[PDB]
Amino acid sequence: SIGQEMQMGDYYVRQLRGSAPLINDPLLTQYINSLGMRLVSHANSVKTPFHFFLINNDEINAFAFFGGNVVLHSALFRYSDNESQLASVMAHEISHVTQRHLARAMEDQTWVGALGSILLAMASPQGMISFTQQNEQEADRIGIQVLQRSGFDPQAMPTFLEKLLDQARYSSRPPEILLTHPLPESRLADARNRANQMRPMVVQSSEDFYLAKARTLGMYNSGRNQLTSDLLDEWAKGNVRQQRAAQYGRALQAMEANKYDEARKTLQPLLAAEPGNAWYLDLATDIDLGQNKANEAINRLKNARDLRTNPVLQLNLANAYLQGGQPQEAANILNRYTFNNKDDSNGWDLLAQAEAALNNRDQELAARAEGYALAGRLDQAISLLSSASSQVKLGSLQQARYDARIDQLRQLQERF
């Protein structure tokens, strides 16, 4: 049924988090899910919630499985020249889910672990899923309709397809994206026709896209996924959005190289123009904490317009409280945060740090258990909660909470 594949989707996500190199950056996962949910917002026959994961892998690839869980390799940011092309890849994956392509592929079939090991191998940088040409024809047709309803450029799908074919037509070994997603000339030709058949729409990539590209290529450096100064030199001559993102990108690398004084005055003009922008506020806290100016980072975030609504600002201020020697205030935010974002391991780890500083050990063990549960290590999480349940009085409310959560984790184990 649908309840099992949502539950089986959680299982694959948990072991993905436990061993694949997922990017857990607040701004990046917030952007990619915001953009992804915007596309789900205009998709048909959606029977599941949707979540979008970002993987630090310089090999371009994209795939999805049960429970509406979409996996995107970080290399997609360097291949996507505009926001509509990146969305073109997501709408393709989203359609793979609503059509239940992999689901029916696994209805004709130790079987869950066999696919879990395959999904894990596709995600890690170092037996692979492939879709039939019929599935891929449907995924482009329905995908381009989701993409037009979402207010992007329908022509971005064929230009992207032609971009990758023009680069991989001759290669002995094409990129992994074309093994999971076979792109013959026939599929490209049909993609270009349906794009030609609808209306022309020239859309500007959102500001958030260009800075997501800069941060992805900037902070999550690795291998071919460096942001060469070639792209930053080019963005310095581009449109008003690409020049700001260019200077944000080098303020980012200045902070990466501990050039904190250089980073502040480099980020200087952008923060003055948009003092309530999360990307600029996030980077400003990194620079302030790197120079042991925790108070200055706290006061800026406390005056932030949407601190009370934006999860990126809450995490930044909670961490600044910690570095500022105010664990209690950090815990007050993180206790609210971890219940508003139960699956966010950043919240759970920071709460564990706050509870350690406060010497509330059973609450620290409880927070540490969530990080282990989300990473698929259920036995270890059960172990921590058993310790937490042993440090509270028998018959106490807290003991009933820990014992009840152990039951949930234990029951989650017996399903697999």
Positions touching a copy of itself (CB under 8 A) are 292-293, 295-296, 299, 321, 323-329, 357-360
Neighbours of 273 (CB within 10 A): 9
Strand partners, 55: 22, 73
Of 19 and 292, which CB lies nearer to a copy of itself in the complex structure?
Answer: 292
Q: What are phi and psi of 393, to 5 degrees?
A: -65, 145
The amino acid present at 222, given as its one-letter code, is S
Residue 93 annotated among the catalytic residues of the structure: yes
Give the whole-angstrom CA distance, residue 28 versus residue 117. 26
Q: Catalytic residue among 5, 25, 140, 364, which?
A: 140
3-state SS class at 69? strand
Smallest distance from Zn ion to CB 161, Å: 11
Report d(CA 216, CA 27) in Å as an integer.
10
| Residue 136 site contact among Zn ion, a copy of itself, none (CB < 5 to 8 Å, cut-off depends on kind) | Zn ion
- Work out the number of other CB atoms within 10 angstroms of the CB of residue 335: 17
Closest residue (Cβ) to Zn ion? Answer: 181
C-alpha span between 149 and 140 (Å, rounded) = 14
- Residue whose tokens read 């990129």: 175
Q: Sort strands 62-65 and 69-73 into parallel, antiparallel or unpaired.
A: antiparallel
Rg over alpha carbons for the chain, rounded to the nearest Å, is 23
Residue whose CB is less far from Zn ion, 88 or 150: 88
Q: Where are the alpha helices (DSSP H) in 155-199?
A: 156-168, 177-180, 185-197
Q: How far is the CB of 125 from Zn ion (least distance, A)?
A: 21
Residues 151-190 that bind Zn ion (CB under 5 A): 181
**Cβ-count burial of 269 within 10 angstroms (0-12 exposed, 13-18 middle, 19+ buried)?**
exposed
- For residue 51, say whether it is annotated as part of any ligand binding site: no
Of a copy of itself, Zn ion, none, which one sits near residue 296, judging by CB under 5 to 8 A according to partner kind? a copy of itself
- State the binding partner of 327 from Zn ion, a copy of itself, none, CB within 5 to 8 A by kind: a copy of itself
CB neighbours of residue 405 within 10 Å: 19
Catalytic, out of 5, 25, 83, 93: 93
From Zn ion, a copy of itself, none, which one binds at residue 68 (CB under 5 to 8 Å depending on kind)? Answer: none
Q: Is 92 annotated as a binding-site member?
A: yes
User: Has 370 been annotated as catalytic?
Assistant: no
Q: How far is the CB of 326 from a copy of itself (least distance, A)?
A: 3
Distance CA 282, CA 300 (A): 10
Name the binder of 181 from a copy of itself, Zn ion, none, CB < 5-8 A by kind: Zn ion
Closer to Zn ion by CB, 141 or 305: give it: 141
Q: How far is the CB of 396 from a copy of itself (least distance, A)?
A: 17
- Gaps in the chain (C to N over 2.5 angstroms) fall after 109, 126
Q: x/- contact string, 127-156, with Zn ion (CB under 5 A)?
A: ----x----x--x-----------------
* SS3 state at 71: strand
Per the annotation, does 136 bind a ligand?
Answer: yes
Closest separation in Å from C-beta 291 to a copy of itself: 10
Q: Which residues are annotated as a binding site?
A: 92, 96, 136
Q: Which residues are annotated as a binding site for Zn(2+)?
A: 92, 96, 136
Q: Which residues are catalytic?
A: 93, 140
